[PDB]
Subunit: 356 residues, 4 copies
């Protein structure tokens, strides 16, 4: 598919965009108070325990073999996996297999189902959610927001009438698993998290700018068909809430949330920063795709590296476990500091909130 | 004409200058609450409704055909258009046509007459103003300030005594249509807006630095004649109030103003930022000229793009209409923030005023 | 002489240093409320009136012809002129003419004698000071501080003991003309100004970093002799109080001072900024020397250029005279803002002070 | 030895790291109030007086000759010298000489022993400490922290259980000399300083980032071995507390500490800055190694240069002695300013603490 081709092989990772993660420093503790072998990376993911506080977030036959590779490696490492949109599989019986195998190959890890928010204004509802969940015996379902991508694509247009949320709220009352609302690379602001929260959504995946740039992907699609919209997309390459800013806004405005910090997480250090900032876990998509494309051992080496990097940051902050990481001392500098200040985030009360 | 030749084909657009608009961020809303097709870009321009909150601002035989192109396309898109200085048409009856074509080809949109503050200093009075208006059946008249251009031009030297403002006030009480006071690239400060406001001026067009650089144009003219003033002009290339700062200072110092945010507006995103910051409409001149020179179809495509970009910023901020855009969430960072703080602009109270 | 050779023809103007004047913005006024021909640049210099608020500051047969040129042009333009150090003329009768000529060629302007603070640590006293004054019928005497130069020069080491100030205080009591204390490229701090003030010094010339870099001059002298001190000098190239910061410190700590704002003043805009910030007049040395070396007509053109640029800044700020310019609206940003804040300069009470 | 090979000949000094000392400005005093020849650089180092407030910090048969050169030059200049880790000398009776020579060739200066904190959880205790000290007749012992280096090295893992401090605390009551706790290039934070202080540690050596980058050194070791941990070390090159930030944090959090400011000290201006910021003395390692390798006269010239540079900064700040330097006027700007602010270092109570 053209989207996968562009994302994996063109220069669109963080193109003219920023996570603001470089504005976050984890304070080095020269006397850690622990040994490396005592570091415990285990944490809760709803009703299950996972081995490392990171998930693979959703990415849409050839698509099913990447999904297979990702799922088996995720299972091995005890990390949760989101699948990409299950709309095609809801509609076409054939496509059901390229999702199913996930649970054949990953019996124990949390698996998160996926449908787009715009589908809720287009006839999708309780049944479809139940089908997407059943299809992979999912432990949760992610509902994704991608208005920026939809705005810049040749075809169709974004529809996010409030009805979607009213329906989602109804759905949440009969679903057997939790709902996560996630972005797709442009981030969740406090106004959006408060709005979602007001309809009963308590679980968020920031998916901020700085990682996969979908506006850049549509720019490329546009250039490829000589569409003038490409020039317009260029103006919006840096559009969105940066991941680090998104983590703060969501944690601040809904302190009881379960929070995935994703969008440009490219190292275990990035993952450690996201968690220390306020996330409960870090999410990754694009670098998982690129490694899985190289093959199973490449993705295994990828996760070994991400996990080493995470434990390195844990060790060097004297953080024996994830709960300790979430309260370790940080510095916030530069644009992220200015962002937080303008946005009314009292850093003093932020600190308190991130640490509880 | 030399000035048009230099503006169109030399490197004078934003030369060593800045709008400060890069310090303005529109907060992305992942659940916009609207569909793209419900976005309404209509707004008021004095007694008329326009289709988009953007105007072409004034730009001075061959200058009549560019005006004709601009005017038929502005009519098509339902956007207001200011003409360039009518001085030559007051002084020569034969220059009237290159303005009279405007109303034949654009019978319904607001059309804004144009005379200089220099003409008012020099004994233009009511009749000249009435004649400029009648010549194009104008819906208002813009009076331009260009002391910087006058300072640096090979020939002549500016006069801006308060007697001209006494004249303007006298004229305004007998005119059939409102007066807009606009700059020409170097922007309107709070002192200047307040002074004008004390003389009954309520409508402003910021025309701040960052776009067409008239000091740069005169520097080039000076270079061309081997005039030593070109070195002095170079020291002044970054002179003036940046467009974003000017929007802020005028809205802050005259809360009730009708305000055009102009000077370096080059995209529908720039336009959306200017309006969200505090302008009622965005103005553009130079890129409209450059597209009109290419032709009617080039300029039609230019406007479709501006409009698409505007609506994309409204969609992605959850702004269903121009009133909502005016109150959407922003971040102010960097030098603009330092500018505002130094100039006594409480950013807390600024938010209140811009949202009303 | 080697110092003039290096200053005039090597890369030492602003080398790795900064005036901080780029952090000072004069607020553009689109309706100035004055005309260009009514602008009055006349100001006071002790008991004389000068035509422009700028002086040539001191610069050390061939040295007497550059002085002669500078003096005749300064007389022509009505601007005060400091001579360079008169030590050699106190020490040798023959060296007197290369100064004396000054007063033959420049009978009316203020002329400022020059002796070093190192001469006061070394046994110059009243008579030597009187002789320096009489030799050129000076209207004031400058005593220069150059400890950085002395530190890094190949030969010898600085002495700035307190008895030299006791001596200056005593001398000042029997002198017929005022004493100005000036630096030589490294700027005057509030601690230094307050100390000088406690001994009766009322008149200061900032000579801050960002213009002529004397540490760079000595570095080059050191390099030219294979002297290892060159590498040490390199580490101190950005040593000193930037001119803009020095102006603020002296104005704030000695509000009643007469203040020359100098050190890196390279245009009439620089000069206008220095005065707006708090100086009574601006000072220049190096670019005058460079022009003088090309000849009298070149220097005449240089002054015409400086004056035009000063009047342009006055015009475009609506400042009818120097007193108006001193209270015109400014913006302070960036490092200078941070400098001022850290040094306890409340930017609100600073405004009050500079405006009186 | 590989670590010396890499430190001395690869690009690892300040690689992707920063001391933050460029954010510290010493205020120039154009009238110093002292002479160069009167400047007194003597200061206390526990029970001894040293000639200059700088030490050589510890660096680990050809390792002995470098040590012998360093020690004899340090003796000549009256500067204290730390040795590298004595672990091998404890285990191997042959290695004792390459440390003991130090004391034959430097009978009078303070000599500082060295063992690593992780040894305390691996069998080392009072006896090994007494041994280390006796072997070189030490005046103090340094216990080093190098967790970041141990994390990234091919072989092994960092062990810093609290037991190590419990043991160290016991040892401290029976040792005949003081204990200094030092980092090794990644700096000491307030949490770590306060933790050490709670176990009785009063003496600290910041060894902050910006100088020798041990994560970089291990990265190169990993590269050379084809180890994938190299890619992970690259992610951590800028990890740690910058030297200037560490000096502020330790002085702030343990105001009566004896404090060595080290990590990236490369000139006497860096040393002066470190001292004025709040250190008692400055420490250097890498540049001493590099000079020692070139030979005795090179190292002699190096110290001459450092000392001249320190006295230059003392002269130019009007600091007659080390006590005066510690209270001289400074400006803190930029990232260091932001770091201190985030970390709750009230810059006003900081000023008091560092000046007492
Ligand atoms: C090829 C590709 C396909 C994607 N498809 C989906 C999708 O079907 N569902 C969805 O929720 N997110 C989708 N995502 C968005 C990711 O889940 C993630 O939110 C975003 O890429 C930011 O993370 P990253 O920077 O680690 O890639 C897709 C991303 C990629 C790269
Ligand atoms: C070629 C040209 C001619 C102009 N002539 C006029 C004029 O006659 N009247 C006037 O009010 N403004 C004049 N303008 C100023 C514009 O109206 C506008 O204020 C300024 O160029 C800043 O907007 P921009 O950056 O979008 O060009 C002129 C601008 C251009 C480029
Ligand atoms: C070649 C040269 C020689 C100087 N000699 C003197 C001196 O004799 N007396 C003194 O007070 N200042 C001396 N100055 C310092 C200047 O008066 C002035 O303070 C300094 O150069 C900063 O101004 P500028 O950046 O405009 O050069 C000298 C400067 C130059 C360039
Ligand atoms: C080659 C080398 C070996 C080192 N070995 C030791 C060691 O044995 N003990 C120790 O405490 N620190 C050791 N250090 C760290 C230094 O003492 C110092 O803390 C660090 O290098 C930062 O200072 P610098 O940037 O001036 O080198 C070593 C440094 C170098 C360059």
């Amino acid at each position: 598919v053209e989207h996968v081709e562009i994302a994996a092989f063109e220069n669109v990772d963080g193109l003219s965009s920023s996570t603001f993660l470089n504005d976050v420093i984890l304070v080095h503790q020269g006397f850690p108070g622990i040994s490396f072998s005592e570091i415990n990376t285990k944490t809760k993911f709803f009703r299950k325990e996972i081995s490392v506080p990171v998930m693979v977030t959703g990415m849409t036959n050839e698509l099913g073999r990447i999904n297979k590779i990702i799922a088996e490696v995720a299972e091995k490492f005890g990390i949760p996996m989101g699948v990409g949109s299950q709309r095609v599989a809801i509609e076409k019986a054939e496509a059901r297999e390229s999702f199913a195998i996930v649970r054949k190959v990953a019996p124990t890890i949390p698996i998160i189902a996926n449908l787009g928010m715009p589908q809720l204004v287009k006839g999708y509802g309780l049944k479809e959610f139940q089908d997407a969940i059943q299809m992979i015996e999912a432990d949760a379902i992610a509902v994704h927001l991608n208005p920026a991508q939809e705005v810049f694509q040749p075809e169709g247009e974004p529809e996010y009438q409030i009805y979607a949320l009213e329906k989602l709220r109804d759905i949440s009352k009969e679903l057997s698993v939790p709902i996560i609302v996630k972005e797709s690379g442009n981030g969740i602001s406090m106004e959006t998290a408060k709005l979602l929260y007001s309809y009963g959504i308590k679980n968020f995946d920031t998916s901020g700018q700085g990682g996969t740039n979908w506006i850049a992907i549509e720019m490329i699609r546009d250039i490829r068909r000589g569409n003038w919209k490409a020039e317009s997309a260029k103006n919006f390459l840096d559009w969105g809430v940066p991941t680090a800013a998104s983590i703060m806004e969501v944690r601040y405005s809904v302190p009881d949330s379960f929070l995935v910090g994703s969008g440009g997480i490219r190292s275990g250090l990035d993952a450690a920063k996201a968690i220390a900032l306020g996330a409960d876990i870090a999410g990754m998509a694009l670098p998982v795709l690129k490694s899985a494309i190289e093959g199973k051992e490449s993705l295994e080496q990828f996760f070994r590296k991400i996990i080493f990097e995470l434990k390195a940051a844990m060790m060097l902050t004297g953080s024996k476990d994830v709960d300790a990481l979430k309260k370790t001392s940080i510095v916030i500098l530069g644009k992220l500091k200015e962002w937080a200040e303008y946005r009314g985030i009292n850093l003093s009360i932020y600190e308190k909130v991130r640490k509880r």
